[model samples]
Target chain A: MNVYRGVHELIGHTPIVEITRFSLPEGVRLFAKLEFYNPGGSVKDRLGRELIEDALEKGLVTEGGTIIEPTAGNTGIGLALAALQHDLRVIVCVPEKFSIEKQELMKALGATVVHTPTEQGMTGAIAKAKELVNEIPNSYSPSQFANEANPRAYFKTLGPELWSALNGEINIFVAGAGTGGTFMGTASYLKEKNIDIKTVIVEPEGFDEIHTISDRNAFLRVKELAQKEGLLVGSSSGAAFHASLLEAEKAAPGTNIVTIFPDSS
Target chain B: MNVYRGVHELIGHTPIVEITRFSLPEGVRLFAKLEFYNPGGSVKDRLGRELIEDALEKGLVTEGGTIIEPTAGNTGIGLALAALQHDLRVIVCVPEKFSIEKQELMKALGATVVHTPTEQGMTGAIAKAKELVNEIPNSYSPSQFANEANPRAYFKTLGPELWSALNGEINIFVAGAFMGTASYLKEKNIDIKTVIVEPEGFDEIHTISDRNAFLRVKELAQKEGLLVGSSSGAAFHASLLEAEKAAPGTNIVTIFPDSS
Candidate 1:
């Protein structure tokens, strides 16, 4: 009980609980890593914290400057937390349609939130963010999609974690794709270990973007999907998820297909 | 990728990302397991899923019965997800002061929400829930606080994950007292795990009944001009930090369900 100082200290050592509730396919055991154990409550907390550090290293983020982005996603939460650490101002341009929990999380970290239209997806939010960069002055909007840092951030951190967690014995890495950074970065790293290890990505149906072999039969379908079309479009990390599961099926008879769900938080 | 055909399939397996931006002592590295990645956007997704299963097993909750609870926390989000999965009718008795995000999530999962007085806190909401249990005949209140299943759910699933992730090399297991399910389950699951960082101790602060001990802490805080009935689990987390500084080589950990 005297191991960690704060929830922050307890972050990385998240437990991989067994999948006891449901039946699983033969030979494959499932263990879910409960990541909400972090203070900020999500797996993206890692990326959120790292993105700003990477920004600082790249000279992209300076103290007291606005870290603007069109996302109120988990990255935004991470950015907000990182911004607090860097003493940087963060303003997230969230689509009105995004979840209230997301908005609250951004605001909880004392971030300035700019609401975009629900009809307009992340692109509109990005456009609005661009407007803030100029109007607000000293604002830095590192668009996660176009920004190479996004993928590099994952490659350097998430990729390395997989290597350590599985000790290079991993057969497949599956993750939900919103920006493809997790996939790109992880794939970048995992490929270094076992080129044969497959990287699978998951995305909602009707979202076909990026050039990839959509393994519909391979991916697991979510129970619900009233989510928006543009938001669900293969603009963000959609491709990363598709690749995660693709590699999972490669394991002979029994192998752990590690799938990282991009947190809705 | 061909693994999970559903979005809920992506509910867990959150990665541990470091908070490099924050200051840390030398040799001290901090990381967060982003459970907020779960479909409901919070970690309670596990609880939401498990509680229903436990209820089903106990015969407390049955086929699409009215699921009722008093919550302004992520528990509702979890329960909602469970309701959606199990196809149950959810009725949430929320205090007026609860976050709108949680409320929207509850509604999104197709729950009937009734607001209680903001001043009354969970008590008021609980009152409303009890009424619904009686009025709505079929309503089953899996009162999370007293519900053995709540903490047991996490114990059976989540807590073991931490032990496995650390593999007996872990120094500590820190979590909030907001709900016993998380801590108690962790205690029950993890072998040799000592309670150095006690969250909102039913022993440390005030000792009422099992659940009353928790609620009374909140009640006393109001009397003491502090945030009463609030999740003081973090205070326990702070104690773990103190212990860590006093004794280096200790790995004090913390888990947050939400707002507690």
Candidate 2:
């Protein structure tokens, strides 16, 4: 009935839209999972909820404990959303000079935001998070980059979602890699479903099948998608769209190419 | 199964969340419709598409015609989204002092934003929009306030959605000074009390101070992870007030138009 008991329950099951406006090779259909539909407005919401819930079940952290994390983007907001639901304290160590709006969003979600030196970048934030975890008792840091839960979240949710949404007719899976969780996890699951499924990882530079998308090109695609498709998406999504086009060109006529738009700009 | 053929297809069927944190009467429960789930991120997306589609069907506008409108917020973005899909040109007349981010969003949706003088306000923008419609060939302004489609959009979509989602069990509906939805549900013979929330100093009935609304907005975000804007917060506040006076086990529903 599209009714949820709480905001946290609105984490996954994002909608996928077929791309019909952009000209593709004849009969080559391109579809993108719009992950901004998540409550935290990103695909990372799945990771955030999974990381905290898995830790709770494993007894790594208790109900009233604290969750500490080092992140500069959507992951912090996702973590904050999950932590608030479980009655846990959240302290996010973000590098200075990160997007002020994102930091404000994290704070709005009741997470304490600590700023590290901008010159030292993400490493400074990570080090600060580690120090805080040691100083604060009953605190756990789900370092997404190293956490197995990061990939498992997608394997459990996104891969199954796409497979069902497309009725297992997917020919290719394309996604952008930030921590490699989204791409690796979803791709691994799809490969298990169909060994012939092509997997492509899009990054600022490149990944599997190695289709490099420059920042300028990515931003341009973002603008184009907003204007043409009325889909306001982030640069990573733009990169995925660009990479998907590259894959679509080489596939058979009736191939179904699926991609993920991780979040809004 | 949550697959859409296009961005516009993702406009409605917003999720409803039960509010459990705030203390209400023992058996009274509150539910809120999160309208930000729409593709353009506001409830107005339904109105925008309905206005355009109705106009086209009625021969008021053609496929390649222009869509002109006077808007200061989400409506412009909504109109642009609808117009873009139909290959129509969109010109939005907005006040110069309106939020820069909103104007950018309208522009991002391929709408040409024409700014009116800040001193003249919405009236000036409306006048400019009227002028533009007359000057441009085959241009139609859906002047939302006067358009019947504004109310009909909700009558056809929102009313049915709420009824089905709650299984016709809603006791009361609270919303921000939006009469179309309330009117539709009432006309359908639904036995529900309708409360309209307005900003304080604007209307005497069910008015909430801007400060109170702002506080509610922050509280919802911090405590419930629902980052909604002032109007939605005001609606939530009004719902809480209604919940207090209602009978035991009464279910109150409210509309959250968009996110902050």
Candidate 3:
């Protein structure tokens, strides 16, 4: 047991767990890097820490200032934890579609939560956040969707971890294309190692191709993974796992396929 | 990155983190074992694993059986995890006063939740659980309050971890006496001194006079970034009381069983 100054120091280096019970094809291997193990409980913890620290270093956000963001859930938790350490007030604008428990968690970490209409989806929250930035004084928005730091954070950390875990022998990299950051960052890093490595985007359904999955399908997949595979992963993970399994079937036998489980339910 | 078969494989060997920022006395040191890092999200994960495994080995429960328990929160989580791994149905009776989040967590893990009246407290939950055992068939209750595995789980794992983390230099071990698991560690490790803490109003046994200490300390702990449960607040309060009386430069250890 080692001593740490605060929770901010506990962000990355999550452990990986093999999908032992998930029945992929013969000779195909599947592994899920458990991102929820990060202290703030999701892959977004990496972005939260990197984004905030980058802002502080550049003098964009100072101590006693406010950090605002439009997050579906996990990023708010990560930012709240980082803001607590940075001594900044956090105001997270979230869509009503996200879990109430997640908003409550952000509030527990001393963040003020503003709810955007569920009909407006994540874009509504983003618009509300922008309005708040203009209305409130001394406020800065991380703007994760547009932030290069979002990809850079995972590229520098999660990408390296995946490379080391697979010893550069990975055949496929699967991730949810929520902000395109997770897939782009990690995929770009792995592409440098092996040009042939397949990077598949698991987008929410109604989008054509690229392993598109619906929210209902994603939710069902999460339940199946938990009950059958003992991993209580988030719905985004379900989408990625669905794509990975399809890839596993098409790939040659004995190929190693890897996917990211963004968070636990 | 390492590979594991299932959640049960991820149960124990939690890391210890020092309380570096919380203002203790000049010479005293405080450390918390991050039990929530355990897959079941509490120290009770150890007991849940042990008690269920012991029952299975003893043939008290078989495949497709039901595991029933009355808990404040964490123990049900532990039991639910163990039952899930073993292919058993879990039904937990809990007081309504406990966090609704905890109950939802148990439900998320596929456990059926039965709520006892908050005014009746844990004992009410226990009685309700007992009534269910009579009403349902092929059911077994670990009855954590009476289960030796409760104390033995910590005695075998947590006690050894403490000794090694401190390198056998711990002078006092203060614990909340809610389940007696914390107190059992000190008795088992006589080399370390022991102090038992209880919330003033909920002193199922005995404690200090200040009734609001538990609530005040709980709030302070959250503000201080600990975000712990009330039992932890009680233990922290008592640890501070012990620290003031001890010689300067003394090292004191306390157990934080779970977090909110």
Candidate 4:
């Protein structure tokens, strides 16, 4: 009886799949949470809902109000999905150079996409979002970068999901750090539970053991997973998988390493 | 725990979402099974696994064997996903006119794509698949259009899911003619009405224009955040029409096979 009332209800509870095709260190097993299973197709769906929920609970926005965000990624799509459930209008400010496919996706979810100058980059998008928020009555921007709700979303949902899914047997948690919300929130929750779980973040220049994976290697891993494992994952997921392999090599025998595939390619 | 050993294990158990935004007849409700939730992104994933499972059980295909199929759609992707689990090589014969994105997707799943002449269409693809099976040793084509496993997949999984989800309250099931038959429910001693929706120009009880289907696809996305394919849009449009004609309190269910 896995029935949902709306698309919003299909946001979380993504499944975890083991990486059995790849060869890891002896006795070290790797599992990846497929975030693409979310209705909005990313882990940011959790953040999007939480940002809206927190705002509503705190009286920042009402049912008929407008929601604003500065993003060119899955966050905009997530925000739009959450906004739909509450009958709220969504305005996403993205840089003009962003992919048209993503902008179309946001628009498909009924979000109005406003593009800032390409040369001004994300800073310009952020400024435009802020300006729009001030100009429009009953509008509030969920600035994900500075918002506490971003991390709290993962802490409340994804962290607990991983802990329970593995039955508390997780050793290391590896993830790609975009705005640091996913890594920080989930890591904080896991640490609070046992204080022994190792957390590794993947970036251009790595963090915590600094296993920096080349872009070519990451993209190659993405291709390998699709061809060999039948897992169509994005480049960020490949980077996290590469980092997980590095972590697996150093971990003790029989260690369980878990990571997140943020979204599909 | 919701932990799976392989991607193939994440094939089924898609959620059914209630259509809340659209206006319907009094006491009439519409629910859609979101088949895009499948790992390979379509209801064909279930059929794919069943076809492979049935073949393996009957010794039609062995491990390290080759699987050939003539499809330019999700069925090919589904076969490739299931084939991966059994270490079977897949060769999908698609007409050259099919989208490059679909071909690349099949290739991404490690399936070799053989292009048939565009003018020959699906007939050419099917002939090519048959030819491939004859040329290659240990090759089998499931031929989904004629296979019993195609319907049995839905019978074993979807029928029971709908029964339990709604507590046997469904009245009418609307879907594309290819997969819409609710015969499985009847086999289970559950009586329900079935509406088969077809695209315009097809001789059917109900038909939807391509323009209307595309409009429904856009409407669902814009209003409900459900980005479904054109066929799904056609089924949904047919569902709404059936809901309008059905008695009050009738529960209508539909299948949304894939994303746009």
Instruction: List candidate 3 segments past 4 Å from native.
Output: A1-5, A55-149, A206-209, B52-149, B178-191, B200-224, B244-246
Candidate 1 docking quality: incorrect, acceptable, medium or high = incorrect
How well does candidate 2 score on lDDT at residue B2? 53
Error of 4 at A247 (Å): 1.9
- Pairs that collide in candidate 2 are none
Ranking by DockQ: 4, 2, 3, 1
lDDT of 2 by residue, A147-232 (tens): 32358778888899999999998988898876633795899999999988888888786434657789888888899999888998
**Is candidate 1 or 4 superior in lDDT?**
4
- Candidate with top DockQ is 4
Where does candidate 4 stray beyond 4 Å? A68-74, A91-107, A111-139, A144-149, A205-207, B62-74, B89-107, B111-149, B178-181, B201-204
Model 1 residue B143 distance off true place after TM-score fit, in angstroms: 18
Real contacts recovered, all predictions: 0.00, 0.82, 0.25, 0.89
Instruction: State candidate 3's TM-score.
Output: 0.71
- In model 1, the Cα lDDT at residue B216 comes to 31
Residue range A131-183, candidate 3, lDDT tens digits? 98898777788664533245777888899988897677688888878653378
Rank candidates, lDDT, best first.
Answer: 2, 4, 3, 1
Q: How well is candidate 2 docked (DockQ)?
A: 0.59
DockQ of each: 0.06, 0.59, 0.24, 0.64
Name the DockQ score for candidate 3: 0.24
CA lDDT for candidate 3: 0.71
Cα-based TM-score, every candidate: 0.46, 0.84, 0.71, 0.85
lDDT of 1 by residue, B102-176 (tens): 676556445678999999987898888888888875568866463323556566656665545554444544444
2 against 3, candidate with superior DockQ: 2
